[PDB]
Design a protein around this ligand. Structure first.
Ligand SMILES: [Mg+2]
Ligand SMILES: [Mg+2]
Ligand SMILES: [Mg+2]
Ligand SMILES: [Mg+2]
Ligand SMILES: [Mg+2]
Ligand SMILES: [Mg+2]
Ligand SMILES: [Mg+2]
Ligand SMILES: [Mg+2]
Ligand SMILES: [Mg+2]
Ligand SMILES: [Mg+2]
Ligand SMILES: [Mg+2]
Lengths: 142, 186, 126, 48, 101, 106, 50
RNA sequence: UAGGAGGGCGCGGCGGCCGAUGCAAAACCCGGGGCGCGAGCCCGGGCGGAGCGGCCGUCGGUGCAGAUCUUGGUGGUAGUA
RNA sequence: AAAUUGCCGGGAGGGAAGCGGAUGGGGGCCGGCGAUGCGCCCCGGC
């Protein structure tokens, strides 16, 4: 974003390639945003992955077991897309993943907004990989 | 059953957000929403309510009137929520600090070459958020050519309203109702 | 895969709002059309005649669009937009769209089982 | 006196030169005005 | 019989925009080309382009062949986008597939 | 006198007397003790996506269900429901959970 | 947009700047935005406002 | 009610974006399941056998129960006169 | 495709039928129609 974050939001709050909107524009409207670096994929300015300098992504890696990528945008390198995101491939267990995410998101005051949400997505991604490894042992309905 | 007019719901209307979907104007709107909410300055209230205006409620104000309004008040920052047009009828303009939406590219050059500083409303919100030492202004609203047509009808006594005429001349609405010698004098 | 809704779903009317005089004729569809007559017993709302939709029959905002499952539905065409319900599976339910292939449905359902997303169509096209 | 430079990304088989960036145009900094863009694009695409 | 109010050739087909308004709009579009979030929102695959605004040397001017143009796109990051268009070509749904579109 | 009980309970001085702030003026000096920052778990196994809420220990302390005036340990009662409807039994005593405890005798 | 290095350096000569007759187009100067800085974060969180 | 305005639903194109489709598209049928107050929408099953949808902007020969409406079909009258 | 007709299976009928609101009785259809998992522990190796 050469232009500021608020302006990018006012530019893309109504249409962009990563926005999946269904059920019309009535009270039934359902809105998600499917860019890689949006955590809840909720299309709001808090979570928007395009209108922000400081964004974090938590994704399962390519085909390989139990490797999670945590990426944070580099604020200063921002007009350089090839060197725009600091990606971090970590493969340790969950408690040491959570400490490192807190290190990279909340503890350095990078963006404490998304302290809890980034960790929640980390839990979801981790257990997704865990069940891709083991299988459906639990119906997860109680 | 209760004896109310339209169930009590307010029947007047006002703007609550500009019809204009200009993103910069929406950002000023957000800023001044914050300011009027957290600051409680009546000046911010008026500025907000005047960003919620149409371009016929935001007429241009030229320097020949702005300088009148700045004659002896150079300490206070002029604010006009509208447009500043130049006016080739004035010669010496005091170095003045004016905040506005737009500056006609010749009027902004006039002000800069006169040595004043030419602001936008965000720069105004920097060094006068509550509006310290500011001079709010409005351009002439009823000066618009269309307004010369409004009011009581052209053909009733004492009305000086311009009637819609497709062209001026002797043949275009001068005959009967505009003089004694053909009918009556309006 | 456990519903998040903690409020009982209440519906002020479950019966549909069929068009007045949809019964006597076949050409009239069942869908509602406001009777515009000047002497229409439906528009004058005599008792014993069909009920019109008001706004008063509206349902609670916090229990609106929840299926009987207690999830709001979201229709997905592919794995790409299936996977973006990771942090909504307690409140959003995927439905694979009606025109996908059975092959892609197997893939979406396999993916949704491991992302733990409720799906109401996992027994479709097989 | 400050404007950023844009480094030119040379290609393969490109001669070595002691070259620097092109300074950022002022046009590339103009207000981004989506409503005017959509209005003007509506009319110009109706103009064909 | 007829159609109601038959279509006539003297509709307003071409609309006029002020020359200065066209120029202002071209200015805003050029400005919007420079912002990586706007391009990425607008739908171009740019995760490997070196710099914005993406500028290549004049050695590009001399190329002749389409393979050479592809090779040029390979140093840049554009070729992901070019492939996106190439594999997203598909028949236009609707009457356009028989109105010469 | 439910109202008089309510007033006497609601009086500030008697609220002191009930909540027993005295004998809390005994243990911790002659001043009311401080509270601290417990619960240093710092070991969350799993992060729920929605806003987190933990389980309730019900801190509310319901009044025991009151017994009828015309019931005294030693009455003969009449059952009404269940398989023993109509049986005439003996009320021994009200057990602690709030239900009557009866015998036939068997 | 991918600009070649010839086009990029004359984009200034074509569209110009905030100066009369600087552009190769007659009667045209770049529009100026209604805000110099559009960072509501910095405005609202500036020392002056806060 | 006459009337006025706002917000939406829906049909068909164009400029864009995201997709589906011979492991079955469009259409149509259903005592199938739902969502919305409602226009309407989503899913299931069958026939079907090749295309189709969603979102943003925008455009239009755009929404039918009447007009002794127009074209085509079908009834009761009637196995009667 | 509907209008409309036939056959098969069901239903109901004292000079109309159809429709609205109640449930009730039949059907027909719904397993995201309705759960079995959390914490504590000890091995037995991973
Ligand atoms: Mg009342
Ligand atoms: Mg007179
Ligand atoms: Mg009447
Ligand atoms: Mg028509
Ligand atoms: Mg029709
Ligand atoms: Mg008809
Ligand atoms: Mg009608
Ligand atoms: Mg039929
Ligand atoms: Mg009879
Ligand atoms: Mg009935
Ligand atoms: Mg019933």
């Amino acid at each position: 974003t050469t232009v500021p974050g608020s302006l990018v939001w006012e530019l893309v709050k109504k249409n962009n390639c990563f926005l999946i909107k269904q059920f019309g524009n009535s009270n039934a409207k359902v809105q998600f945003s499917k860019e890689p670096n949006n955590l809840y994929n909720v299309h709001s300015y808090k979570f928007s992955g395009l209108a922000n300098s400081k964004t974090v992504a938590v994704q399962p890696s390519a085909g390989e077991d139990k490797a999670v990528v945590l990426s944070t945008t580099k604020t200063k390198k921002q007009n350089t897309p090839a060197k725009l995101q600091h990606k971090t491939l970590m493969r340790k267990e969950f408690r040491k993943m959570a400490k490192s995410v807190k290190n990279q998101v909340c503890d350095n005051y990078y963006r404490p907004d998304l302290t809890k949400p980034a960790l929640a997505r980390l839990s979801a991604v981790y257990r997704s990989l865990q069940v891709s490894k083991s299988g459906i042992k639990k119906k997860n309905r109680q | 059953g209760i004896d109310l007019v339209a169930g009590g719901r307010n029947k007047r209307t006002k703007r609550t957000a500009p019809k204009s979907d200009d993103v910069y104007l929406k950002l000023l709107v957000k800023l001044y929403r914050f300011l009027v909410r957290r600051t409680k300055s009546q000046f911010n209230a008026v500025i907000l309510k005047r960003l919620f205006m149409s371009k016929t409620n935001r007429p241009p104000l030229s320097m020949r009137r702005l300088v009148r309004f700045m004659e002896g008040k150079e300490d206070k920052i002029a604010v006009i929520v509208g447009t500043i047009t130049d006016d080739q009828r004035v010669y010496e303009i005091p170095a003045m600090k004016v905040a506005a939406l737009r500056f006609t590219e010749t009027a902004r050059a006039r002000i800069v070459n006169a040595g004043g500083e030419c602001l936008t409303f965000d720069q105004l919100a920097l060094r006068a958020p509550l509006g310290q030492n500011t001079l709010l202004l409005r351009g002439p609203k009823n000066a618009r050519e269309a307004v010369r047509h409004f009011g009581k009808a052209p053909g009733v006594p004492h009305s000086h309203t311009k009637p819609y005429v497709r062209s001026k001349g002797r043949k275009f609405e001068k005959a009967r109702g505009r003089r004694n010698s053909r009918g009556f004098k309006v | 895969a456990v519903p998040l809704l903690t409020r009982k779903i209440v519906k002020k009317r479950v019966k549909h709002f069929k068009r007045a005089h949809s019964d006597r004729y076949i050409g009239l569809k069942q869908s509602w059309r406001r009777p515009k007559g000047i002497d229409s017993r439906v528009r004058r709302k005599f008792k014993g005649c069909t009920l019109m939709p008001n706004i008063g029959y509206g349902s609670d905002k916090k229990t609106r669009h929840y299926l009987p499952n207690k999830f709001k539905k979201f229709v997905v065409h592919n794995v790409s937009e299936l996977e973006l319900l990771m942090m909504h599976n307690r409140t959003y339910c995927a439905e694979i769209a009606h025109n996908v292939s059975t092959k892609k449905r197997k893939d979406i359902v396999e993916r949704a089982a491991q992302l733990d997303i409720v799906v109401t169509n996992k027994l479709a096209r097989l | 006196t400050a404007r950023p430079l844009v480094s030119v990304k040379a290609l393969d088989g490109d001669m070595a030169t002691d070259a620097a960036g092109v300074p950022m145009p002022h046009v590339m900094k103009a207000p981004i005005r989506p409503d005017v863009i959509t209005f003007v694009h509506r009319l110009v695409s109706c103009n064909s | 019989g007829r159609m109601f109010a038959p279509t006539r050739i003297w509709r307003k087909w071409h609309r006029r925009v002020n020359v200065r308004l066209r120029r202002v709009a071209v200015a805003s579009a050029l400005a919007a080309t420079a912002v990586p979030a706007i391009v990425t929102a607008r739908g171009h695959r740019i995760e490997s382009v070196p710099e914005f605004p993406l500028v290549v040397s004049d050695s590009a001017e001399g190329i002749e062949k389409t393979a050479q143009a592809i090779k040029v796109l390979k140093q840049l990051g554009a070729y992901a986008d070019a492939e996106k268009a190439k594999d997203s070509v598909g028949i236009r749904p609707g009457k356009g597939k028989m109105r010469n579109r | 006198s439910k109202m008089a009980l309510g007033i006497k309970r609601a009086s500030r001085s008697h609220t002191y007397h009930r909540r027993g702030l005295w004998a809390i003026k005994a243990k911790h000096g002659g001043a009311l003790p401080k509270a601290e920052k417990p619960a240093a778990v710092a070991e969350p196994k799993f992060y729920p996506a929605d806003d987190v809420k933990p389980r309730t220990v019900s801190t509310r302390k319901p009044h025991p269900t009151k017994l009828r005036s015309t019931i005294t340990p030693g009455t003969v009662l009449i059952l009404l429901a269940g398989r023993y409807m109509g049986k005439r039994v003996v009320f021994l005593k009200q057990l602690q959970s709030g239900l009557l405890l009866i015998t036939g005798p068997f | 947009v991918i600009w070649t290095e010839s086009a990029f350096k004359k984009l200034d000569e074509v569209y110009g700047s905030f100066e009369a007759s600087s552009s190769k187009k007659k009667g045209f100067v770049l529009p100026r935005p209604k805000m110099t800085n559009a960072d509501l974060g910095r405005l609202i969180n500036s020392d002056e406002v806060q």
